Amino acid sequence: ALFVHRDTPKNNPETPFDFTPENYKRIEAIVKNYPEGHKAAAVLPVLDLAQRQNGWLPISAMNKVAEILQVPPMRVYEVATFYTMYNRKPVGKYHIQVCTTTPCMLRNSDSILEAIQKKLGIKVGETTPDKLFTLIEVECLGACVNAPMVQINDNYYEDLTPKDIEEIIDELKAGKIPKPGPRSGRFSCEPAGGLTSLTEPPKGPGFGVQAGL
Amino acid sequence: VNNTKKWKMEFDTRERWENPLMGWASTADPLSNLVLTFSTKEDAIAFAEKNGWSYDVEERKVPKPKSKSYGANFSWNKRTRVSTK
Amino acid sequence: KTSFGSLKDEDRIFTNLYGRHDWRLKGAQSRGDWYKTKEILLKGPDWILGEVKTSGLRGRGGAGFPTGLKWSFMNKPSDGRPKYLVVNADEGEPGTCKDREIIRHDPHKLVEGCLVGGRAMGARAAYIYIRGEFYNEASNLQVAIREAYEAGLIGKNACGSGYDFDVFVVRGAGAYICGEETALIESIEGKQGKPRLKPPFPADVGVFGCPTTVANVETVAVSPTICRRGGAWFASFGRERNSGTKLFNISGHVNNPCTVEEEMSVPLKELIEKHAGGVTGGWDNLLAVIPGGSSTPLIPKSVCETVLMDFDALIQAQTGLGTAAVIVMDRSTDIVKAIARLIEFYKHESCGQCTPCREGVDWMNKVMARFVRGDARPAEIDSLWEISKQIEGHTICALGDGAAWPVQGLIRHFRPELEERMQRFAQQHQ
Numbered sequence A: 001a002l003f004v005h006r007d008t009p010k011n012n013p014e015t016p017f018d019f020t021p022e023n024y025k026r027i028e029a030i031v032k033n034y035p036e037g038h039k040a041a042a043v044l045p046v047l048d049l050a051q052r053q054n055g056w057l058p059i060s061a062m063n064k065v066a067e068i069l070q071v072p073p074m075r076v077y078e079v080a081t082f083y084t085m086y087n088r089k090p091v092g093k094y095h096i097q098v099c100t101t102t103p104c105m106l107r108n109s110d111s112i113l114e115a116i117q118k119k120l121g122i123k124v125g126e127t128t129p130d131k132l133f134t135l136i137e138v139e140c141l142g143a144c145v146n147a148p149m150v151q152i153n154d155n156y157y158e159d160l161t162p163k164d165i166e167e168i169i170d171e172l173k174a175g176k177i178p179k180p181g182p183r184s185g186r187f188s189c190e191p192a193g194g195l196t197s198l199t200e201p202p203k204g205p206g207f208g209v210q211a212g213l
Numbered sequence B: 001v002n003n004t005k006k007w008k009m010e011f012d013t014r015e016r017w018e019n020p021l022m023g024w025a026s027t028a029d030p031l032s033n034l035v036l037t038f039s040t041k042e043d044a045i046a047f048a049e050k051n052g053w054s055y056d057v058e059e060r061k062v063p064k065p066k067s068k069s070y071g072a073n074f075s076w077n078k079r080t081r082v083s084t085k
Numbered sequence C: 001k002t003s004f005g006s007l008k009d010e011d012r013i014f015t016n017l018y019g020r021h022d023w024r025l026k027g028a029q030s031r032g033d034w035y036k037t038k039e040i041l042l043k044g045p046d047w048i049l050g051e052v053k054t055s056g057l058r059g060r061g062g063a064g065f066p067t068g069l070k071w072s073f074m075n076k077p078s079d080g081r082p083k084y085l086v087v088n089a090d091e092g093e094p095g096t097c098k099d100r101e102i103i104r105h106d107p108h109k110l111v112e113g114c115l116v117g118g119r120a121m122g123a124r125a126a127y128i129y130i131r132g133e134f135y136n137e138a139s140n141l142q143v144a145i146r147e148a149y150e151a152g153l154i155g156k157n158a159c160g161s162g163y164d165f166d167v168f169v170v171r172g173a174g175a176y177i178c179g180e181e182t183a184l185i186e187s188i189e190g191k192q193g194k195p196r197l198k199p200p201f202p203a204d205v206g207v208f209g210c211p212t213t214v215a216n217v218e219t220v221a222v223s224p225t226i227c228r229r230g231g232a233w234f235a236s237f238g239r240e241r242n243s244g245t246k247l248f249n250i251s252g253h254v255n256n257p258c259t260v261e262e263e264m265s266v267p268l269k270e271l272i273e274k275h276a277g278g279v280t281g282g283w284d285n286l287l288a289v290i291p292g293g294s295s296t297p298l299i300p301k302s303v304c305e306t307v308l309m310d311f312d313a314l315i316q317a318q319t320g321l322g323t324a325a326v327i328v329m330d331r332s333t334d335i336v337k338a339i340a341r342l343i344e345f346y347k348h349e350s351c352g353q354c355t356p357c358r359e360g361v362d363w364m365n366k367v368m369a370r371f372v373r374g375d376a377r378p379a380e381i382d383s384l385w386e387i388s389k390q391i392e393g394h395t396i397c398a399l400g401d402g403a404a405w406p407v408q409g410l411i412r413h414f415r416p417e418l419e420e421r422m423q424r425f426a427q428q429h430q
């Protein structure tokens, strides 16, 4: 929760970090998306790439991103502390993010936060001792009609009950991967008691196209 | 900048020494605290010449007009891009 | 036309909103996407801007600026710099989950919107700034962009029209402020997502210092349907200056929380009772509705009975249309706790750049955290009102406005509930 860095033996500028060569090819593809003379625009993806290789960002991933993009290291530190996805501390293998803003709080996200807490034996911000789960509490994840929902590392788990999130944590501990979707009967975002719209077949190419075109 | 509006006349600083009893700053200069305020340079010059004071005049140093553009922080091809904000 | 709503399925722009059809290129072309795109591109920028101006399309991001007038700010000869369309796909607004559905289920509609809009504004390329939390949606959009490049629909000689146009996807990294257009531009440029002061508007100095239009996913993705069906078709829905269709996200205390496409000036009661299954406990169980996502002020049940869900009728209801994200709150809701959680959101999502938001949004969150418990006195209500008025209009971007407005709506419609909260705190703690 701090925004200064102190050198620890597991987080220092001599902590070993380097990209894999396939990650260097991915970095070249990232840098080619931006105009010549604006290589600094590749700070946010490549640093995120450094989080996808390592799981988190020690201050050698920040220094390596600053070195390969020829930007000052402070301008990478600003990005790494500004944005809430960059893990500047090592998180667990499954980073559970429970949304507790008002559309999820109205549909009882506190019960699911408590269910994760009493299932994993930890609280908000802590990590399980086997380094598998980090539970934090995030803002609106943009799945508001699928409230209450969580995010696990890339995946949204939606329309949750305490039983559903206990089942998801059970099959995360069992090595399997759960299905990223609503755990209720519906599929993505439709009304749960049947389609109130888009029941007709779509019309296809050419329908309603005006004259002179 | 409100303290840079008027002309001032001061005098050359004379000796300040240590009081033997208390360490206070003793002076023998009666004009050591005399600061006069004038609206223009010519009023100050006329007042100094009227009183027989030999004077030296420094001209008013105004800050020159700067060219400020907030859009220059985000140029396409110039060095005046800010690296942060 | 006087009554609005009951939109037919043949008039839906966002068919395959629900993922029930193939989102890929065969399914998109079988639903009407990428049809006669070359004939749209060869009619020039002025024809496309005329169709968007005639359609009455306003900014679906949430402010409702006229889209054709906005996009015509780029309709000017080049000065050596390239031009850029930038598609705002951040969608950080609580309540709002519609652009996720467009990216996830109709991605080629967004890509064709990028092509048509960038042809209208003379843009070289499209940068779709997607939210970093929408990882599966971003990879979904990248598969559709690969299908559009491999079909020759974008890229070198896009749709066989002789117009070159790339479509890039930049992922965010977890900042709600990076959906504000200049903060989004700063986030694309590899910096902290801090908003720029306006002027310069992005059509003068935008991304990389180039001319730039930042436009929402929804106002971009409806533009090929506007160019095909006609602007007079799109202006036939909703009231005047309130034209078209709109995606609505009804969440909170309804029976069936859902995203649905609906005609523009639909009643809020008709929308909730028709597509969302009504309020939990009936319509008489309704306490308040945040009409357009978290930045719009709440309206109580007496306003929600007759109000129309477009821009002008919600401005007359002293709230905003916003992102058209309907957050429904029933009688069992601690409404001070919900608005204070919303102000807690706005202090966790505040980039810290300017003084009134950086200091006053945290100070409003502290006052609201005391108002939940009642640990306050009633003279601090009007005080808080003034604090909101010292943030509104005094900040760099409208996140300060969007934090002041829920406080103002809560005070304006629920001052007696705040007062009875504080007096019961005072009588059971003194």
Ligand SMILES: NC(=O)C1=CN([C@@H]2O[C@H](COP(=O)(O)OP(=O)(O)OC[C@H]3O[C@@H](n4cnc5c(N)ncnc54)[C@H](O)[C@@H]3O)[C@@H](O)[C@H]2O)C=CC1
Pocket (backbone or CB within 6 Å): C059, C060, C061, C062, C063, C064, C065, C070, C090, C091, C092, C093, C096, C179, C180, C181, C201, C202, C214, C295, C296, C320, C321, C322, C323, C397, C398, C402
């Ligand atoms: N969609 C979402 O996820 C969210 C949407 N919003 C909405 O954002 C809105 C505020 O957004 P802003 O862009 O900060 O405010 P708005 O006043 O400025 O401007 C909207 C658009 O019009 C353009 N514009 C406005 N006046 C102009 C002028 N004189 N010359 C040239 N261009 C001009 C701006 O460049 C911008 O692209 C609110 O109404 C809120 O509901 C807020 C938060 C989240």
Ligand SMILES: Cc1cc2nc3c(=O)[nH]c(=O)nc-3n(C[C@H](O)[C@H](O)[C@H](O)COP(=O)(O)O)c2cc1C
Pocket (backbone or CB within 6 Å): C058, C059, C060, C061, C062, C063, C064, C065, C067, C070, C088, C089, C090, C091, C092, C093, C176, C177, C178, C179, C180, C181, C182, C214, C215, C216, C217, C219, C397, C398, C399, C402
């Ligand atoms: C704090 C803040 C966050 C915003 N977030 C978004 C967003 O996530 N997505 C979006 O389309 N517009 C967002 N906007 C509105 C944009 O500034 C801008 O008006 C819009 O993205 C593009 O204009 P348009 O509505 O014509 O498409 C936000 C505005 C503010 C003040």
Ligand code: SF4
Pocket (backbone or CB within 6 Å): C177, C194, C195, C349, C350, C351, C352, C353, C354, C355, C356, C357, C358, C395, C396, C397, C398, C399, C400
């Ligand atoms: S008002 Fe808040 S969100 Fe906007 S520039 Fe200022 S600190 Fe940033």
Ligand code: FES
Pocket (backbone or CB within 6 Å): A099, A100, A101, A102, A103, A104, A139, A140, A141, A142, A143, A144, A147, A149, C093, C094, C095, C096
């Ligand atoms: S409120 Fe939880 S996802 Fe938007």
